[PDB]
């Protein structure tokens, strides 16, 4: 039994976290009271990766819910699957973090972090063989970003030989709460570079463009963005949740050739709006999945090169046709795969589809084009930082300009490290 411990931090972290638990609960047949009512036992062979078993044939998510504010967690307990969650795993302050990384990481969040770690310990102790952790959070606020990355540092200290992966929502001015997000994101990214094994980069800019341009939603809401996030989260975790022999470490080994370059581009096909009679064809799943339009990180894959790629196809389909179409798409895009990692494109098929689609495919791309995302953040960061604009919110919590200068430099080293491998040849 290779259990995963899930942590959701802050507003974005808990909203997308709750959708995730809603979506996979339905996939495993667990109802809002934790009672199993499914029709296949494929649903229960790996149920324990994400769920604990409690007497009474109940299944309880191995999930810890964290915020510095109670608001968004009252709404979780309200929401459709709110009762599923273990009540002692709600860990909440009252102050809120004011979209301030310094409050989440250094002052308000430091006050609360030990309480969170007590619940993490008490979930890990009950794990036959802990596989690792996943965190859902945004990088643009204060709690998920600042206190989320503090948690990751503490978790590493206590579990240094355990996998730490994240679903990290990147800020965009197109979907923006405050002007200081580039500061919060830049500080968080350096933490992630050091202390996560895999970070799935969920770019709110891509989720907006997708909703606005392809789904023709003229006023996208957080709900529309999260419909895409939840589809992708169900997707990437499909092969951890159903039979097919790789734990998180084995996936990291074959996806991450250099330790700092572990920021992945997600993607999904078919792109859908909430509320699909035509099943897509294996050729259609494949080409959409590689097209910039389905990329949930606003990066152009044709502007860089793929170091590794993974794709998970869901539904009853031809593995022969999957192999053929995958090997196809690699030849019209053959220049965009590094030639010094042989066979760096890998595929899985799972015959259980997601709710509401008979054919679907999830994309996991480790592309050097991701540097466009970090350049974009870095440019917004510098635009304000060259005038020290809005810094007083941070110096007022004990931070120094130097920590911002280091975060900036660390960020630009990451961009240069990507550019190194995009020009590397055989």
């Amino acid at each position: 039994m290779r259990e995963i411990v899930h942590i959701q931090a802050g507003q974005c972290g808990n909203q997308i976290g709750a959708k995730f638990w809603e979506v996979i609960s339905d996939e495993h047949g667990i109802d809002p009271t934790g009672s199993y009512h499914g029709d296949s036992d494929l649903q229960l062979e790996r149920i324990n990766v994400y769920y604990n078993e409690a007497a009474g044939n109940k299944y309880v998510p191995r999930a810890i819910l964290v915020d510095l504010e109670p608001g968004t967690m009252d709404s979780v307990r309200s929401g459709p699957f709110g009762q599923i969650f273990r009540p002692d795993n709600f860990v909440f302050g009252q102050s809120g973090a004011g979209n301030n990384w310094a409050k989440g990481h250094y002052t308000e969040g430091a006050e609360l972090v030990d309480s969170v770690l007590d619940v993490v310990r008490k979930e890990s102790e009950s794990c036959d063989c802990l596989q690792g952790f996943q965190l859902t959070h945004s990088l643009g606020g204060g709690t998920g970003s600042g206190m989320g990355t503090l948690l990751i540092s503490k978790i590493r200290e206590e579990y240094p030989d355990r996998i730490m992966n994240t679903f990290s929502v990147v800020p965009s001015p197109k979907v923006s709460d405050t002007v200081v997000e580039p500061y919060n994101a830049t500080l968080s990214v350096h933490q992630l570079v050091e202390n996560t094994d895999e970070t799935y980069c969920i770019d709110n800019e891509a989720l907006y463009d997708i909703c606005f341009r392809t789904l023709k939603l003229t006023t996208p809401t957080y709900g529309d963005l999260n419909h895409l996030v939840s589809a992708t989260m169900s997707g990437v975790t499909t092969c951890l949740r159903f039979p097919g022999n790789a734990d998180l470490r084995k996936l990291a080994v074959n996806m991450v050739p250099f330790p700092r370059l572990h920021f992945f581009m997600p993607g999904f096909a078919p792109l859908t709006s909430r509320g699909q009679y035509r099943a897509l064809t294996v050729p259609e799943l494949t080409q959409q999945m590689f097209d910039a339009k389905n990329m949930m990180a606003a990066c152009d894959p044709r502007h860089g090169r793929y170091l590794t790629v993974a794709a998970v196809f869901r539904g009853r389909m031809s593995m022969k046709e999957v192999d053929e179409q995958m090997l196809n798409v690699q030849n019209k895009n053959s220049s965009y795969f590094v030639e010094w990692i042989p066979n760096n494109v890998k595929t899985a098929v799972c015959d259980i589809p997601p709710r509401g689609l008979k054919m679907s495919a999830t994309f996991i791309g480790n592309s050097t084009a991701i540097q466009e995302l970090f350049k974009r953040i870095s440019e917004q960061f510098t635009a304000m930082f060259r005038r020290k604009a809005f810094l007083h919110w941070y110096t007022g919590e004990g931070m120094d300009e130097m920590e911002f200068t280091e975060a900036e430099s660390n960020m630009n080293d990451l961009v240069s490290e990507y550019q190194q491998y995009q020009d590397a040849t055989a």
Partner: protein, 61 residues
């Protein structure tokens, strides 16, 4: 966090001290202006005594 505590405290301290210095110098200043006014009025009272006395002595003629 220690730096945050120290700067909030230093701010509280210097604000408490600045106001104390200002309240004190205002009290001294206002008192000295009142004292000067009363001293001038008092000097009027002597001059009036000196005028009444000067009349005692023109009546000794």
């Amino acid at each position: 966090i220690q730096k945050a505590i120290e700067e909030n405290n230093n701010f509280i301290k210097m604000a408490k001290e600045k106001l104390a210095q200002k309240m004190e110098s205002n009290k001294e200043n206002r008192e000295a202006h009142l004292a000067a006014m009363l001293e001038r009025l008092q000097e009027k009272d002597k001059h009036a005594e000196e005028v009444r006395k000067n009349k005692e002595l023109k009546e000794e003629a």
